Structure formats: structure tokens, C-alpha cells
Amino acid sequence: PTQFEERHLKFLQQLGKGNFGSVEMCRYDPLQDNTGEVVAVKKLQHSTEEHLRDFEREIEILKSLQHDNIVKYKGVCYSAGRRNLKLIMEYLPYGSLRDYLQKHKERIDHIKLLQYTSQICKGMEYLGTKRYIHRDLATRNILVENENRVKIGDFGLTKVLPQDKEYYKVKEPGESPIFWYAPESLTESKFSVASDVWSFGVVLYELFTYIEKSKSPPAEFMRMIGNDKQGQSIVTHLIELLKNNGRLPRPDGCPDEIYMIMTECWNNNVNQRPSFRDLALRVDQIRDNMA
Numbered sequence: 153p154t155q156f157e158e159r160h161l162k163f164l165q166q167l168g169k170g171n172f173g174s175v176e177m178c179r180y181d182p183l184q185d186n187t188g189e190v191v192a193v194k195k196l197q198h199s200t201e202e203h204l205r206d207f208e209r210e211i212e213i214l215k216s217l218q219h220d221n222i223v224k225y226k227g228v229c230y231s232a233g234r235r236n237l238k239l240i241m242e243y244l245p246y247g248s249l250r251d252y253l254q255k256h257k258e259r260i261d262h263i264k265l266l267q268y269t270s271q272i273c274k275g276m277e278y279l280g281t282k283r284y285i286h287r288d289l290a291t292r293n294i295l296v297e298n299e300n301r302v303k304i305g306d307f308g309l310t311k312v313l314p315q316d317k318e319y320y321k322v323k324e325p326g327e328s329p330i331f332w333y334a335p336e337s338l339t340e341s342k343f344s345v346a347s348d349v350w351s352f353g354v355v356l357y358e359l360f361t362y363i364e365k366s367k368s369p370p371a372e373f374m375r376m377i378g379n380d381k382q383g384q385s386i387v388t389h390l391i392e393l394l395k396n397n398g399r400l401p402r403p404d405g406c407p408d409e410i411y412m413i414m415t416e417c418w419n420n421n422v423n424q425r426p427s428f429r430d431l432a433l434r435v436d437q438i439r440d441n442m443a
């Protein structure tokens with residue numbers, strides 16, 4: 153049931169792409185009458201042996217994952233061999249939470265934002281049981297199944313903690329989403345459950361800005377860094393700002409208990425950040441107290 157051949161895949165539209173890989177909406181049509189299922193297909197552009205290995209790892213991670221708030225794995229297309237693999241994932245027509253929230257902001261109140269928030273916490277909790285560190289938690293990488301269900305997607309950066317260590321050190325990072333990254337991820341390239349918790353704080357921030365462009369994490373951090381950028385890089389400026397307890401401001405509208413959860417997630421000390429279970433319990437209870 154998981155054997156997808158190249159001759160049956162039909163291109164419909166490009167959903168998005170990056171520097172090394174792309175995501176397309178395709179129809180898997182073995183009966184060639186256009187009745188076949190519509191799927192999301194990932195492929196790579198210019199592949200080195202370690203980019204190939206990363207993709208093989210992502211596929212292994214995706215194989216083992218079954219959860220209501222995690223995007224469904226379907227299979228792989230082996231037709232062109234190891235060198236040119238295609239990852240087959242479920243096509244979600246409502247797209248990313250980032251885009252979905254901007255579009256439907258008038259029908260998405262605080263109670264709904266917290267509904268999404270705790271689904272992300274439960275998904276992340278399940279990830280933790282397998283020692284998986286996501287590394288790319290952001291509303292752009294959360295996908296929408298319907299008005300009442302969101303799913304964590306893009307597992308392209310996801311790593312597996314060693315059996316005896318609580319962090320994973322990435323030996324060669326490319327372009328990173330630095331305005332979602334914990335300080336220790338920036339300074340030491342160390343990724344853990346606690347760095348995912350930091351990132352979840354930024355996701356919660358995202359949700360309560362309603363994806364207002366001027367209030368996005370890059371926008372506010374660049375504003376906070378200032379016009380005197382001479383002498384050092386942006387990442388260096390961000391490191392000093394975070395070290396000095398500079399943080400993303402409270403959106404004017406955001407409940408104080410919600411902003412508190414953010415600032416706790418944004419603790420400099422990895423050992424003082426809350427757990428995803430605690431986060432789920434605190435979010436569910438604030439959501440209950442609202443209605």
C-alpha cells in the first residue's frame with residue numbers, strides 16, 4: 153500500500169520551495185483517469201551525500217510518527233533510486249497556520265488560538281517521547297486540517313537526541329531561522345526539548361500578534377537591535393540583546409497569563425524552561441477560564 157511509482161505522479165501546482173528542495177501538489181493516478189488521490193510531494197534540487205542522508209533521516213522520523221496533530225506520512229517514491237527520492241505526504245488544502253490565521257483572523261478569537269496552541273503542545277509532547285527535537289517550530293511549519301485541527305509539519309530539520317545526552321549539537325548549520333532560536337542554539341548550536349520550548353514561545357507570540365507584519369519576530373528584533381548596526385553581524389547583535397534580557401514585547405491585546413507563558417519559555421537557562429506537558433495544562437486551563 154506504500155509503493156508509489158514515478159509514472160503515476162502528475163504535477164498540479166508548486167506549493168513552495170527553498171534553496172535545496174521543493175514541495176509540489178501532485179495527483180497519484182495509477183488508474184490514469186484523474187480519480188487518484190492528491191498528495192504533497194517533496195524533492196531535492198542539488199544533492200550532496202549528506203543532504204541525501206538528512207532526507208533519508210527525515211523519512212525515517214516521518215515513518216515512525218502517527219498522531220492526530222502531526223502531518224500524515226504516506227510513503228516514498230524509489231523509482232529513480234536513492235539519488236532522486238520523492239517524499240509523499242498528505243496534502244492539506246488549508247495550508248500553513250501562518251497564512252490561515254492572516255486570512256481568517258476575524259473568525260479566530262483567543263479561545264481558538266489556545267485550541268491550536270494546545271494541539272501543538274500535545275504534538276510536541278509526543279515527539280519528546282521518541283527523543284525527537286523539531287528545531288523548526290514556527291506557524292509557517294504548522295499546517296491546518298480544518299478550523300478545529302492543526303498539525304505540526306516540516307520535519308526537515310528534525311534531530312534525534314543521543315541515548316545518554318539531553319542535547320544534539322549540529323556540526324554544519326546553513327541558513328537558520330535565528331529569530332525563533334534559543335540563545336544556546338545561536339551561540340553553541342545546541343538543540344533540545346528546551347530549545348523547542350523557546351521556539352514554542354515564539355509560536356505563541358506569533359499567534360497573539362495575528363501575524364501582523366510590523367509585529368513579526370524579525371520585525372520587532374530588528375527594531376530592538378537599532379540603527380547602529382555598524383561593527384558586527386545581526387546574529388551577534390541578537391545574541392547580546394537576548395543575553396541582556398531583551399525580549400519580544402507583549403502585543404497590546406494579549407492576556408497577561410499568555411505573555412507570562414512566553415517569557416517563561418524565553419528563560420536563558422535551559423533547565424528553568426517549562427515542560428510541554430505543563431504548557432498544555434496551563435493553556436487548557438486559561439482557555440477554560442475564558443468561556
Ligand SMILES: CCc1cc(O)ccc1-c1ccc2c(C(=O)Nc3ccc(C)nc3)n[nH]c2c1
Nearest residue numbers: 167192194241242243244245247305306307308
Ligand atoms: C511534503 C513536505 C513536508 C515535509 C515534512 O517533513 C512534513 C510535512 C510536509 C508538508 C508540507 C506542506 C504541505 C501542504 C501544503 O503546503 N499545503 C498547501 C495548500 C494550499 C496552498 C495554497 N499552499 C499550501 N500540505 N501537506 C504538506 C506536507
